[PDB]
Structure 1
């Protein structure tokens, strides 16, 4: 099973001998026979090499351009350019998975991808290779975006083939030109709108394990497509949602502020301010109900893996968690428990903290919020672990020294914490023996945490800012891109016609002769060189 299905034709291509493969083809050796061996499969837990499980793909994946043309343009036995393995990966799919985003492999794969598309048009004019999907139902374009192959995704998106009768395989066209000025179109098909896997959908709705999902939106069609989606309709809908949440969170703030302080809720209706407060309290629960149902609407439609629900898209959880706090308030309010206030102030504090969601849509706010994110997961977490070891380590030493009031682990942890915030007493208690021991414990704690730990946290954040400053504009654009796609799905949901980016334009001719119309996106470039 380790090499099951392997034929002598596989070894000839493996050894890189064009004469040896010719003899086997001449003798009738099977060319479509597939090596369904685990060594030839991915099998990430074991060493091996994946190439597409086909002799034809072996030549393509091993830079054997002649053997690819040999297996297709010969006379004895012509290989199938549309052949799919057990996984269903076409040779185009195999070329995508071989790519590993390094400099040399990208030039390799994007080249071999070109001619095998060029050859297929000459040999199978009516067949469209890229439209074929594997058993996973992913086209090579969708697989490159899914697996993070930015090197070949950039190639496919802005592909232009100069040679006639195969120009219709191109994706980046040209409407016209001038002296220094030329306007170039983009195919834009299966990019923003598609049946199953759009390029924008797969790049945005990734699991954060994708290598270059931030930079995959930087390729030329995607950045301008998302930016114009923002400017056309998404920006105003986002600003409307921002205003509604601000209005909702101010109504909730005033209803909580003017809550009655008498016992045993619910509270009876009196005067005129109670009807205004209950009015604002009804709208608060409605917003809590809306954010509760929008959360499960998010869980059912995207099915998070419980790993990409806390690291990414935690904003969805924190909005859902606030709704949970709001619904718990209503349960406790009608249960006559005073603990409804405890849940209501956590819903109030989290609800106002959730106002930081809308820092995307503003470039300087969004980049700032992306940097705030990086500190918590890179600097604050490391600081707090070491700080809590010191804080709990010295508090237990101090409270053991304290005798017969700070003789409590909580009262001592609070006094030592005040040192962090510039409010350290250093003489908060005198109820002990061994005053020298007490002073040495506090002075050691002060030097280790205040002078050393806190000042070094500032030094570490500056190092974090330096590295992430250039890249944080790409995380923000990804965060806004997810907002752009989420807005489209929620808003239109009836016709999907007013937000159509680009326009249907005649780009060329089908090789049969029919007119091909592609929803194309226009980009104008100016070059003062290459006249």
Structure 2
């Protein structure tokens, strides 16, 4: 109902044209009608539209210079008045002729002293998918987006300012990144830098960030303008020597690596969501850098990190399988055919030196659980329960399990001091979520790990869209079996003797695991064989065999998507590694300056062949 208020007013805007004789004569070139419209009497001028127009705005909007020339002769005061109502707020007639890419009227409006620095800050211009467009907030910002180059120089010549910024802090050089006509706007970016006369006081007009705090180079990395990124690299690199077909160049490397602050360049590529921008990882100075940093020093620190965790789980699961049990004392099997149990484990009996060996491993796993908590969820000293909602989707899928690995190991610290009955249940999740987590180390380790990016893409969606429709069908038949054996003895075919297990066992026949019941000794009810054969056609010949073919398109449709997603997680491992690991170890890559006459910013180089 939000966008309804736009077009409700927008037809209503046209009503005032049909309502007024001035505005309807303004939409057409009614210069004969406009001649007598203000000469025969002193009719008023400032009658606004439904959303606050002048006829000068309308003559601008419906591309009519001629009546606007008569409107200049009638009343040359309308130019100062902008529009006023909440969508087109502050926009004046200088903007619209620029949007119309010429009207030979910037020759006329500026001659009538067109105010340039007005800020059309209405919400029909803010960067949002509710608008279909984005153009900035200044007339110099507009004409660049439509590239009317001759108009731009005349717009500059009467005192345009390059350094204008918006509420978002962006200047005109941020805007040319955001246009969707990529290469047609690239030569526009070269033109404005030619009109950079000087640095104002500190930076030479390209080094300025926004209110988000990003230079326009880094913003191109955010949106992933692949063509524009290659054009803005050309002043960063520095060719060194050429040898026939040999080319030896020195890339810059000061904007594209972690220098302290959280906004280098590479954190931004992982933390964004746009799939288009992840293809920045195949341009020249970055792909060589990340492959160098992963190979030298990057890979073996990850694996030797992984070797510790593998011994952690072994020291957990051996401490799991040894456990202070006891024979079943003081409690018979007095519930007959209900308790088939023998242990009811001990309470405080560690009086054995072999238990000290277990007392090692229990102490081993509990301290590392605190380490896992205080390295990835540090925001626990605040003690915020609603903070956990900002930790679920903020973080990867493997950034969820290992957190939940900790809580279960916290419970076996909690429970064994309290010594209550329920003990194997938190230990159960503690044991199976542990071993499943080792695929987090199967990210790299060889090229045998873009298998794991495939099973990630399949478990979300393409089995969850099957897990519903299994429960669609199977909740029918299981109750249908539950009725159809309701009159039956349990001691033969105890599959469906009660609904909580009868719901389970029909799920055991959907995946063909259990054999499918038959006695063949006494005669089963004569409606079973009908409805059960109905079950096997739908389940294990239609439904499940569809699913293998269902993967059949979602395995080559995403063929070269898994490989580009495999280059995602290595950078996501590399940047995560450098930020966690300190100095005097992991020497920061590239080659330093100050020794060779270059400067303080570091460098790397790549030698190749033109061919």
Match of 1:204 among 254, 270, 273: 270
8 Å contact from structure 1 (residues 142, 197) kept in 2? no
1:334 aligns with 2:422: no
Instruction: Give the aligned partner of residue 252 of structure 2.
Output: 187
Of 126, 129, 133, 2:209 maps to: 133
Aligned to 1:512: none
How does 1:274-289 map onto structure 2 within 5 Å?
274-289=355-370
| Deviations 1:127-186, CA, capped at 9 Å, x for gaps | 433321222222223333334444434443xx22xxxxxxxxx02321221111102222
Are 1:141 and 1:199, in contact at CA under 8 Å, matched by a contact in 2? Answer: no
For 1:165, the equivalent position in structure 2 comes to none
Contact 2:450–2:562 at 8 Å: present in 1 too? Answer: yes
The answer to whether the Cα contact below 8 Å between 2:325 and 2:345 also exists between their aligned partners in 1 is no
Equivalent of 2:301 in 237, 251, 266: 237
1:417 maps to 2:500: no
| Contact preservation (8 Å) 1:205, 1:482 | no
Secondary structure at 2:250 match in 1: strand
Match of 1:389 in 2: 472
SS where residue 466 of structure 1 aligns?
A: coil
Deviation at 1:121, TM superposition (A): 6.0
| Residue aligned with 1:40, SS | coil
CA distance in 2 between counterparts of 1:272 and 1:142 reads 62
TM-score (norm 2): 0.75
Per-residue deviation, 1:86: 2.5
Alignment pair present for 1:315 and 2:405: no
Q: Is the 8 A contact 1:506 1:517 kept in 2?
A: no
Give the 3 Å change call, closer, same or farther, for CA 222–278 of structure 1 in structure 2: same
Tell me by how many angstroms 1:431 deviates: 12
Between Structure 1 and Structure 2, which shows a larger proportion of helix residues?
1
Kept in 2: contact 1:187–1:520 (CA 8 A):
yes
Residue 117 of structure 1 is matched in structure 2 by 193
2:428 aligned with 1:345:
yes
Task: Quote the RMSD (CA, aligned, Å).
Answer: 3.1
CA contact (8 A) 2:593 2:599 kept: no
- Contact 2:236–2:252 under 8 Å retained in 1: yes
Asked if 2 retains the 8 angstrom alpha-carbon contact of 1:264 and 1:336, the reply is no
**2:564 aligns to what?**
474
Higher-Rg member (1/2): 2
Q: Cα distance 1:86–1:421, how it changes in 2: closer, same or farther (>3 A)? A: closer
Q: Indicate if the aligned counterparts of 1:264 and 1:337 stay in contact, CA closer than 8 A.
A: no
1:76-475 map, 5 Å: 77-99=158-180, 105-120=181-196, 127-156=203-232, 159-160=233-234, 170-194=235-259, 195-206=261-272, 208=273, 210-262=274-326, 263=344, 266-297=347-378, 309-310=392-393, 313-404=396-487, 405=494, 406-428=496-518, 435-475=525-565
The yes-or-no answer on 1:526 pairing with 2:609 is yes
**Aligned mates of 1:61, 1:441 — CA distance in 2:** 68
Name structure 1 gaps, 5 residues minimum: 100-104, 161-169, 509-514
Select 1:30's aligned residue among 115, 121, 136: 115
Q: CA deviation at 1:124?
A: 6.8
Q: How much does 1:43 deviate? A: 4.1
Residues 303 and 445, structure 2, Cα contact 8 Å, conserved in 1:
no
Query: Would the aligned equivalents of 1:415 and 1:428 in 2 still touch at CA under 8 Å?
Result: no
Distance 1:69 1:433 in 2: 97
Q: CA deviation at 1:108?
A: 2.4
User: Aligned equivalents of 2:576 and 2:300: distance in 1?
Assistant: 14
Q: Secondary structure at the match of 2:399?
A: helix
User: In the comparison of the two structures, how many residue pairs are matched?
Assistant: 498
Retained in 2: the 8 A contact 1:504–1:518? yes
Sort the Cα spacing of 1:202 and 1:123 in 2 relative to 1 into closer, same or farther, 3 A.
closer
Of residues 49-58 and 360-369 in structure 1, the stretch that sits farther from structure 2 once superposed is 360-369
1:516 shift after superposition: 5.5
Q: Aligned partners of 1:261, 1:434: CA distance in 2, in Å?
A: 44
Conserved? CA contact 2:415–2:423, under 8 Å: yes
Residues of 1 paired with 2:229 and 2:379: CA distance?
A: 28
Q: In terms of mean alpha carbon deviation, does 240-249 or 213-222 score higher?
A: 213-222
TM-aligned CA distance change 1:393 to 1:507, over 3 Å: farther
With over 3 angstroms needed to count, the CA separation of the structure-2 counterparts of 1:317 and 1:300, relative to structure 1, is farther
Please state whether the residue corresponding to 2:276 is helix, strand or coil: coil
- Indicate the structure whose relative CO is greater, using CA pairs within 8 Å and at least 6 residues apart: 1
Q: Give the Cα–Cα distance (whole angstroms) in 2 for the partners of residues 395 and 19 of structure 1.
A: 79
**Separation in 1, partners of 2:230, 2:519:** 67
Moved more, 422-431 or 258-267: 422-431
Secondary structure, in 3 states, of the residue corresponding to 1:92?
Answer: helix
Alignment of 1:56-71 (within 5 A): 56-71=140-155
Task: Provide structure 2 residue ranges, at least 5 long, that are not aligned to the other structure.
Answer: 1-85, 327-343, 488-493
TM-score, scaled relative to structure 1: 0.85
